[model samples]
Target: ADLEDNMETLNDNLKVIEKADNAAQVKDALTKMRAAALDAQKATPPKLEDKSPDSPEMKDFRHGFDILVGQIDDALKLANEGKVKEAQAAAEQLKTTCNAYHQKYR
Candidate 1:
């Protein structure tokens, strides 16, 4: 359930990023998504019989999300620098990556 909760937040954040209409919205979405990643990293693990809480698989899951967040961070920078088109491409990439990770892990 914990993992599911975290994934829901991630999906929500992705929606915000996907539907962003301007730089300000993108920036806000990045902040929200980054916070979600941090929270997910800190939260307790879900109760799974086959996996330990400190398993490498759990770490990799969070690490993958961290990488995605880093990409969004760069996208936010591009948006701030007035490269709206490039920023949007990055955002699209972020969305695709998020979807893949979500489907693959969550």
Candidate 2:
């Protein structure tokens, strides 16, 4: 739930920047996103008796998150240009990343 909230906040903030008309606004948004994502990364991972990443589920989970990181890069690029449509598409892909990981791991 906390992860969901963080991702939603990131999405909303990204939209706010997507609507901007210039690079400065987009830069601001990207800065915020970087901060938020860093905070999210700082969060403690789930403590399972099994912390190994050998399971197929864990592999899927890692892949999903890797894709999410890629989406983040895409989003940052689009947002830097204040391209709403492109940013929106990237955001959708990022959402897919989150959903896939959640379904697999949580």
Candidate 3:
């Protein structure tokens, strides 16, 4: 699913961000992730029209993922302002949101 693909991409970027030495790299990475999330949101909800409502994975994969990624926009702002800890905390929240979605869907 595209939602899964988005999650994979976010995970990859987060790995890089977690270890980034400076804010510039982290900001760049967050920008990419936010873009991907925006794309995912556009693709996800509309594509699931035929799937049964009972399919939990297929359901929130849209809404939940969109929320998680939307948070990254704020994360980017924090990182750009040199608030690394706050940015990382925001990233952690996104990670937790992603984890819950994955476990529910998969």
Candidate 4:
């Protein structure tokens, strides 16, 4: 339920993802990134704490994480296929998606 901690974990893992020199390293970082995102998704943001999980807005909040997870999943596939350049590019592309969602949820 500690959203900030999980977010920190995500942040740290993201650093690893960005610096990764190989697909294997990227895959490992992405694995941890996905887990952090999944865990954080369950914790309601402070602004939405009063909202039920099923509330449309809250649902959207969690759904944003799903999109983030999907991004990670896609990169994982690239890494699995040894597409290092693509996975690295995907890692950079991910930050924009995060900025959009963070503004909404924060």
Judged by TM-score, which candidate is best? Answer: 4
Task: Compose the digit string of candidate 3's lDDT tens values, residues 34-94.
Answer: 7677667656444455677588655565677677666877887898899887877787888
Instruction: Give per-residue CA lDDT, model 1, range 4-93, as digits (tens).
Output: 576677678667666777777767767777777777666654432356667887777677667877887897788798666677678677
Deviation (Å) of 32 in candidate 2: 3.3
Compute the lDDT for candidate 4: 0.81
TM-scores for candidates 1 onward, in order = 0.73, 0.56, 0.73, 0.89
Give the winner by TM-score: 1 or 3: 3
Q: Give the distance in Å from residue 39's predicted Cα in candidate 4 to where it truly belongs.
A: 0.6
Q: What is the lDDT of residue 40 in candidate 3?
A: 75
What is the C-alpha lDDT profile of model 2 across 1-106, one tens digit per residue? Answer: 2555656666776676557666566556656655565555534346322656577544544455566656667776876676655765665676666566567455
What's model 2's lDDT at 86? 71
What TM-score would you give candidate 4 relative to the actual structure? 0.89
Cα displacement (Å) at residue 62, model 2:
5.2
**lDDT tens per residue, model 4, 20-67:** 888899899888878878988887568678886467887787777788
Q: Would you list the C-alpha lDDT of every candidate in the order shown?
A: 0.70, 0.60, 0.73, 0.81
Could you arrange the candidates by lDDT from highest to lowest? 4, 3, 1, 2
Stretches of model 2 off by over 4 angstroms after superposition: 1-31, 47-50, 53-63
Top model number, lDDT: 4
